[PDB]
């Protein structure tokens with residue numbers, strides 16, 4: 001069976017007695033596919049990922065998934081530790097690390113530190129820009145050997161050309177055979193996705209292919 005993620009008629013609430021944050025959501029992702037998730041602010045995109053990760057329990061419907069998840073938060077975060085430690089976690093693969101550094105354009109940033117990627121981040125440490133933090137957080141999520149990659153608006157703070165270059169080098173190329181969900185608004189990104197889910201006010205506006213969306 002190639003099917004990796006199934007959501008069936010999911011409705012969910014963050015608050016008991018509140019308004020549902022997701023209403024009758026459906027999608028299916030096969031192994032290696034890219035699902036783009038789009039929609040305006042507050043539409044429920046991050047909430048959808050929280051359902052997949054088990055942080056938000058459905059009040060009806062089913063989320064079917066078994067496997068390791070790697071999550072890139074839309075609020076990019078840094079741990080105390082070196083740049084290399086922030087990215088690699090528990091399993092060292094030098095070739096994979098170099099490929100992720102390259103695809104996230106981190107070589108130029110690292111090259112400017114005397115300690116290179118052994119520079120130690122933390123309280124009293126150097127200050128990283130929003131865009132440097134986003135690319136380190138993306139590197140960490142993409143480096144992990146996982147079964148499903150949940151990339152929640154990972155290009156924060158990047159200018160338009162950098163976002164295009166990294167969407168191509170990381171999400172399209174480096175991760176070409178990985179099962180991926182990307183929260184993104186750019187029509188250029190949706191055009192490359194295998195499936196698209198557009199949310200509006202917690203409901204499914206559209207679920208289909210880009211050609212189906214153009215129609």
Ligand SMILES: Nc1ncnc2c1ncn2[C@@H]1O[C@H](COP(=O)(O)OP(=O)(O)OP(=O)(O)O)[C@@H](O)[C@H]1O
Nearest residue numbers: 014015021039040041042043044045046047048074
């Ligand atoms: N952990 C949480 N606890 C309670 N409410 C939450 C939580 N996370 C999100 N919400 C709420 O759920 C609704 C949907 O927001 P969500 O963050 O899923 O939207 P989004 O589509 O990810 O928005 P954005 O594009 O701004 O990131 C909002 O009303 C928000 O306040």
Ligand SMILES: [Mg+2]
Nearest residue numbers: 045046047074
């Ligand atoms: Mg969000």
